[PDB]
Amino acid sequence: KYRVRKNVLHLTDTEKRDFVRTVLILKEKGIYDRYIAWHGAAGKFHTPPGSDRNAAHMSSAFLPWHREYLLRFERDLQSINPEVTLPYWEWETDAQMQDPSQSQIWSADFMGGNGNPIKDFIVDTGPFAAGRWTTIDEQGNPSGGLKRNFGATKEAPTLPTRDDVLNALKITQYDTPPWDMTSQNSFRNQLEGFINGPQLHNRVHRWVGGQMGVVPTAPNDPVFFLHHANVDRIWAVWQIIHRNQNYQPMKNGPFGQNFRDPMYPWNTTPEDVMNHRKLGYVYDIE
Amino acid sequence: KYRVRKNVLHLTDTEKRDFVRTVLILKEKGIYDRYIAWHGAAGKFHTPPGSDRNAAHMSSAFLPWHREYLLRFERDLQSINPEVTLPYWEWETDAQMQDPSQSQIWSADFMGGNGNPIKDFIVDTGPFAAGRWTTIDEQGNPSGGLKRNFGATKEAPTLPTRDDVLNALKITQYDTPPWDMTSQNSFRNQLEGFINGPQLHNRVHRWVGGQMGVVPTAPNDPVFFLHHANVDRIWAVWQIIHRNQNYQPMKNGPFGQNFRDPMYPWNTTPEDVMNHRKLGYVYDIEL
Numbered sequence: 001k002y003r004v005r006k007n008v009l010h011l012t013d014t015e016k017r018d019f020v021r022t023v024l025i026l027k028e029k030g031i032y033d034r035y036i037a038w039h040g041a042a043g044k045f046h047t048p049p050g051s052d053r054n055a056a057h058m059s060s061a062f063l064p065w066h067r068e069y070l071l072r073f074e075r076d077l078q079s080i081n082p083e084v085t086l087p088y089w090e091w092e093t094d095a096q097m098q099d100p101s102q103s104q105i106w107s108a109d110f111m112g113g114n115g116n117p118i119k120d121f122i123v124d125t126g127p128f129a130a131g132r133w134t135t136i137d138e139q140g141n142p143s144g145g146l147k148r149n150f151g152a153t154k155e156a157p158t159l160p161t162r163d164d165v166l167n168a169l170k171i172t173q174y175d176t177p178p179w180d181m182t183s184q185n186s187f188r189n190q191l192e193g194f195i196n197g198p199q200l201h202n203r204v205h206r207w208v209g210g211q212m213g214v215v216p217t218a219p220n221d222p223v224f225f226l227h228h229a230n231v232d233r234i235w236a237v238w239q240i241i242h243r244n245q246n247y248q249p250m251k252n253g254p255f256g257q258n259f260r261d262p263m264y265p266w267n268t269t270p271e272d273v274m275n276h277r278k279l280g281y282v283y284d285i286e
Numbered sequence: 287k288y289r290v291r292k293n294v295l296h297l298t299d300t301e302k303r304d305f306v307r308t309v310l311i312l313k314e315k316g317i318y319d320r321y322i323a324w325h326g327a328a329g330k331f332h333t334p335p336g337s338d339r340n341a342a343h344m345s346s347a348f349l350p351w352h353r354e355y356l357l358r359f360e361r362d363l364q365s366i367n368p369e370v371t372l373p374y375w376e377w378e379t380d381a382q383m384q385d386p387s388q389s390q391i392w393s394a395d396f397m398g399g400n401g402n403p404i405k406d407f408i409v410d411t412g413p414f415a416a417g418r419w420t421t422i423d424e425q426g427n428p429s430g431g432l433k434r435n436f437g438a439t440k441e442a443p444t445l446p447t448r449d450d451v452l453n454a455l456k457i458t459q460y461d462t463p464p465w466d467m468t469s470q471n472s473f474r475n476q477l478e479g480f481i482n483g484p485q486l487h488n489r490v491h492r493w494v495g496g497q498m499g500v501v502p503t504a505p506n507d508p509v510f511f512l513h514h515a516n517v518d519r520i521w522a523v524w525q526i527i528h529r530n531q532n533y534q535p536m537k538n539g540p541f542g543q544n545f546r547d548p549m550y551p552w553n554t555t556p557e558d559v560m561n562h563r564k565l566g567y568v569y570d571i572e573l
């Protein structure tokens with residue numbers, strides 16, 4: 001109820017400087033890479049083997065996993081500077097723009113810009129520019145630069161809209177059998193983006209392009225966290241009507257996707273993280 | 287102090303029963319696969335990125351990583367069954383045998399036997415034979431079948447000997463720079479087995495064959511844990527012999543190899559595990 005997580009657009013210049021700076025410190029120490037690795041790792045962890053589900057995606061644990069991810073990340077930032085929290089990127093209002101790429105989130109003082117065509121869409125503005133920020137590939141090897149290409153795909157030329165959000169927010173069930181990319185009338189599946197894909201979360205990933213467009217590489221872009229903070233906030237909002245909806249499945253689901261199963265690669269359960277307040281942070285507006 | 291890890295050969299039959307049982311239960315519950323994945327993951331987390339060194343092998347943290355690994359793994363065994371402990375495969379004794387394949391670790395009632403060349407080295411005997419034990423690959427996908435092929439390589443025709451263990455224990459340094467498979471007079475590197483390799487730990491892996499012989503799949507073979515229990519034990523004897531030495535690097539190593547660096551994929555540090563008795567077990571030879 002203490003750490004206040006803010007809209008990237010309500011941050012002061014000081015808050016921006018200090019968040020970027022903390023992020024770079026984590027990078028330099030070597031801790032930022034644990035997160036790329038963790039996310040890649042859970043990606044190839046099938047629940048169960050022979051299945052389309054993995055620990056972080058395409059199943060119920062998708063949300064509590066990323067919540068857990070983000071908590072650990074914020075707490076690492078904290079160890080550096082106890083003032084800094086995680087901002088969220090409200091992409092749905094950026095959807096209202098003529099050119100969403102002109103959002104202040106992509107200023108050189110913050111995330112930096114879209115990839116440069118002349119340079120194969122490598123990001124060359126901001127602090128996370130090539131030369132300033134090392135990327136890691138799927139094998140855990142240096143890849144040579146952050147890439148971005150806003151709206152380059154045919155499936156994801158635009159961002160989710162406010163109306164897409166209100167629409168997921170109407171779903172009353174958290175998730176439904178079989179607990180996968182096929183689940184219908186599922187808030188989890190709808191938020192994730194598979195119902196008439198790609199929507200919301202998935203659409204945003206696809207819209208950014210670069211590493212962000214590929215599962216094993218997405219957390220090479222620090223805006224991965226900004227995006228997953230908006231996702232986590234929307235889940236918070238859904239849970240603002242009461243309560244956690246027994247987070248299906250409670251039981252009898254695949255191991256690692258039940259209320260009290262450990263979420264690889266950690267020992268943390270979904271229940272462990274169902275209430276964000278208990279975790280120690282709150283969203284602005286709350 | 288209280289949990290006693292024992293030589294496999296001194297285990298009663300019912301001790302071998304319950305251990306095998308417990309492992310099959312972890313496997314059925316879906317917890318066993320977490321251990322295979324955890325090891326594959328750490329195997330691909332390089333320190334620093336672009337290096338040989340990874341969270342689990344080829345650097346200083348090799349020993350305490352595999353120590354944290356087995357601890358978490360024992361604690362889970364004890365969740366299912368409190369009297370079950372992680373036993374050790376004293377492979378340097380089997381080395382003194384005319385035929386190490388006659389070792390009782392390989393009997394149908396414990397680990398099961400060698401791979402089947404007609405079956406392409408699939409293991410057809412014991413609790414972990416094909417049709418009774420599913421395997422996953424590098425990618426988390428089913429591979430259908432534990433494989434083994436004892437002593438079949440040119441580089442690892444035999445198991446490491448008693449004298450091999452004795453000569454490493456004589457090493458005075460835990461580790462030395464540059465903290466990689468290029469470290470000399472390093473107890474860590476000798477034990478891991480890169481000096482004139484494969485020797486000691488590496489040699490064993492390669493001797494067994496199959497999944498055990500490849501890094502990102504080895505824990506598919508339950509023997510992985512008996513083998514790493516011996517390694518841990520070897521390391522703990524060294525700790526007991528060299529009371530004025532400690533783990534290195536204390537600082538100056540790459541992130542993840544230093545004494546108080548977190549070991550991917552966990553937060554545990556080498557420090558948290560330097561004392562094995564403080565973790566709650568000892569090896570039978572200490573009593």
Ligand SMILES: OCCc1ccc(O)cc1
Nearest residue numbers: 205206212213214215218
């Ligand atoms: O287009 C986005 C691809 C992608 C989606 C989800 C992830 O976690 C990572 C990458």
Ligand SMILES: OCCc1ccc(O)cc1
Nearest residue numbers: 488489491492500501504
């Ligand atoms: O000789 C190979 C040594 C080795 C050690 C650990 C593994 O996990 C795999 C192989």
Ligand SMILES: [Cu+2]
Nearest residue numbers: 056057215218
């Ligand atoms: Cu993801």
Ligand SMILES: [Cu+2]
Nearest residue numbers: 201205218228
């Ligand atoms: Cu994502």
Ligand SMILES: [Cu+2]
Nearest residue numbers: 325342343501
């Ligand atoms: Cu290993």
Ligand SMILES: [Cu+2]
Nearest residue numbers: 487491504514
């Ligand atoms: Cu090993």
